[PDB]
Design an enzyme around this catalytic site. Structure first.
Site, PDB file in Angstrom:
ATOM      1  N   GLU A  69      -2.596 -11.918   1.575  1.00 34.09           N
ATOM      2  CA  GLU A  69      -1.819 -11.614   0.613  1.00 34.09           C
ATOM      3  C   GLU A  69      -2.584 -12.346  -0.781  1.00 34.09           C
ATOM      4  O   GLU A  69      -3.056 -11.261  -1.688  1.00 34.09           O
ATOM      5  CB  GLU A  69      -0.318 -11.727   0.615  1.00 34.09           C
ATOM      6  CG  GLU A  69       0.368 -10.621  -0.372  1.00 34.09           C
ATOM      7  CD  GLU A  69       1.861 -11.069  -0.376  1.00 34.09           C
ATOM      8  OE1 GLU A  69       2.317 -12.030   0.399  1.00 34.09           O
ATOM      9  OE2 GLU A  69       2.559 -10.316  -1.251  1.00 34.09           O
TER      10      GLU A  69
HETATM   11 CL    CL Z   1       7.361 -10.166  -2.440  1.00 29.83          CL
END
Ligand code: CL
Ligand code: CL
Ligand code: CL
Ligand code: CL
Ligand code: CL
Ligand code: CL
Ligand code: CL
Ligand code: CL
Ligand code: CL
Ligand code: CL
Ligand code: CL
Ligand code: CL
Ligand code: NA
Lengths: 399, 400
Positions: free
Chosen positions: A129
């Site tokens: 991420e």
């Molecule tokens: Cl989040």
């Protein structure tokens, strides 16, 4: 001709579908991926479906229809669809691996039922991420032909910091990520702080502060004078993030009562951070390695949505702390009447979230003084959302 | 009819050369251990590499018939020692690889490169070696546990093939079957780097150049040069300004204080996964049998020779170590006079280290401890990564 790709970002607040498009990748050029359309799925994040995965299909349908309506039929079978879930789903997985799996299988089942090319439904890692958000912003800033910008990402459940440091170390080699993009191998520091997104941080603070003694009231300096909201204790303790503060409480439910004091709010926030253990040269908080800061940063997602709200009220640290302090002390009825177009679910949180962002950046990451100016708040670049999804698409398109 | 191949495993403690031979049929023909330390110690001494490699290469030329030398490939794969040197200085690491290459190419074989292999390759290749040797490929597979001077690897096929960190994940096809293997290499958690992490963490300005240390025998002494201790990336996180150039470790042999000091170099506070190994690294639930080799084997073998020559409960292995750690250094030397003191002096540390790593690191506690098989050789060939590497790099591994 044109190519398309769909990425679902299953975040803790909401699911967002993104459609990307790019020139079909011929030899006689290169061209860029760009965001074509976005859809926000109505409802909470997917983890709230754990006990009703039979409704996942229906939950995703409207935004999936947008995609089949938007992408030409002759281009659909060859269009990839991927869903990446983030910290909300990591928390659900910590609670119950089986729920998480039953959620993700119902998502695959639904997505597989469309005319697109299913590429998977996964919980992406905190490092992924973070790295992918750094990819998105440096790609969009044109940096992948010199130095790169760092990436600060804030969501409801976690927050990420990703940057190339001055010196690459084995200090915490599980905080390093090396990858190749356009002939360059890159070595980034990246870390995701689970439970330190803005909503989980507030649950931590409430759990920390709630008194057995209180008769079911918590006065809280992080909300406007006159603000009131009832909190279910079962919901409060229903996240892994508050396990360390769990106590037996003689009530099932309690009312938060705003007292609007930025300084007390700041102090109360600092209390869910641990700065006492650092098995490295230096750390962020909770004994986590952080290299010295280096370069300029793009701050996005809730960093942007919250900062921009305060900026629009006026851009130094001193100036932003002042605007936040003053706004915190404004009564809740005044606040709602002054921003009558804003969903009360967001408006009720800006005092808290602004003081939190300031604590995180200044005390957590040490962006004090000289460094404050190295942070650039961004929502879109060249019309694509700053986020992880575009970098995920770039790499999944073998770019 | 015969075919040969050569692989030098350039590890942190030693370079080992292996000659393999074949028409699960590939076999180690002979190993040679290169005298001296690992190639990264030659960083400023690269002119000496040639002489260093000479004995083992001469062996190889004597052993493989001249008639066969030219179609015989030679590979060097270097591991975590050279990963650390590349961190310390990409320059140096490169000059060493260059000096190794020049030398190998001066021999009459098919030179095929000298390179630093990745942690995942190192792990996956070890797991291939032990399952090829065990004939688990002709079914369930064994997990691989590798421990060297500078890193440690854990590789196995988890129950769930959707791993939580697909960064720890490899998916391939071997001899008809699809595998998803979890693999991870923990740099700095080899037994020698772990000792340096621990000593760097424990030395204090107040030490006055003496460090009493419970992981060494009463009566044992060892001098540690500070600029050398701090010359590994593995201690950078513990560096401090010290008002001495060197200090002397003085053993106090107490197992349980040793154990506690050891635990202090692992971070076990945060895990965003269902479960972790240490330092926030995902580890699936353990399953099936494991073969634990290299330094897991040589250290454990020394201890089980105190346990009715069989690895017994964790409880009995612990007690054995505990007793052993207490013995004065003169006594330990007197009781094992055939063992090189460089090994002997490290056994209390290494044993306590291996028990912590396996039991708290890799979570082999309780019930799971029994499923570790410590092995050096299988069917006369060494357990390690070199055979699996050979097999793949000679594309001698079919998908069906
Ligand atoms: Cl989040
Ligand atoms: Cl969620
Ligand atoms: Cl959340
Ligand atoms: Cl540092
Ligand atoms: Cl408004
Ligand atoms: Cl509203
Ligand atoms: Cl080496
Ligand atoms: Cl090693
Ligand atoms: Cl070493
Ligand atoms: Cl003695
Ligand atoms: Cl002996
Ligand atoms: Cl000796
Ligand atoms: Na563990």
């Amino acid at each position: 001709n044109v190519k398309y790709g769909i990425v679902l970002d299953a975040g803790s607040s909401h699911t967002n579908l993104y459609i990307y498009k790019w020139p079909a990748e011929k030899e006689n050029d290169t061209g860029v991926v760009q965001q074509l359309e976005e859809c926000q799925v109505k409802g909470p994040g997917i983890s709230k479906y754990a006990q009703k995965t039979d409704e996942i299909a229906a939950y995703l349908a409207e935004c999936m229809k947008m995609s089949t309506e938007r992408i030409p039929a002759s281009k659909q079978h060859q269009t990839p669809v991927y869903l990446g879930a983030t910290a909300g789903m990591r928390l659900l997985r910590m609670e119950s691996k089986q729920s998480a799996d039953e959620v993700l299988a119902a998502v695959s089942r639904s997505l597989k039922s469309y005319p697109f090319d299913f590429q998977g439904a996964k919980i992406i890692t905190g490092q992924e991420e973070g790295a992918y958000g750094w990819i998105t912003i440096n790609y969009l800033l044109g940096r992948f032909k010199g130095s790169t910008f760092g990436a600060l990402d804030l969501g409801g459940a976690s927050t990420q910091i990703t940057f190339v440091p001055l010196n690459s170390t084995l200090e915490a080699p599980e905080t390093s990520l090396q990858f190749r993009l356009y002939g360059t191998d890159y070595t980034v520091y990246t870390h995701s702080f689970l439970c330190y997104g803005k909503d989980q941080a507030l649950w931590q603070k409430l759990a920390q502060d709630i008194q057995v003694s209180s008769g079911g009231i918590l006065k809280d300096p992080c909300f406007y004078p006159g603000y009131k909201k009832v909190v279910n204790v079962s919901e409060l303790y229903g996240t892994p993030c508050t396990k360390r503060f769990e106590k037996k409480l003689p009530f099932n439910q309690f009312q938060v009562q705003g007292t609007g004091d930025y300084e007390q709010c700041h102090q109360s926030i600092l209390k869910i951070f641990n700065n006492s253990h650092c098995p490295y040269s230096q750390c962020a908080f909770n004994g986590v390695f952080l290299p010295p800061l280096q370069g300029s940063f793009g701050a996005f997602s809730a960093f942007y949505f919250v900062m921009d709200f305060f900026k629009k009220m006026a851009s130094s640290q001193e100036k932003m702390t002042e605007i936040t302090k003053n706004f915190c002390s404004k009564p809740w009825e005044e606040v709602k009447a002054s921003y009558p177009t804003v969903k009360e679910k967001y408006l009720s949180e800006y005092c808290f979230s602004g003081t939190y962002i300031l604590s995180l950046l200044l005390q957590g990451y040490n962006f004090t003084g000289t460094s404050w100016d190295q942070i650039h708040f961004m929502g879109k670049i060249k019309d694509s959302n700053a986020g992880w999804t575009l970098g995920y698409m770039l790499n999944l398109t073998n770019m």
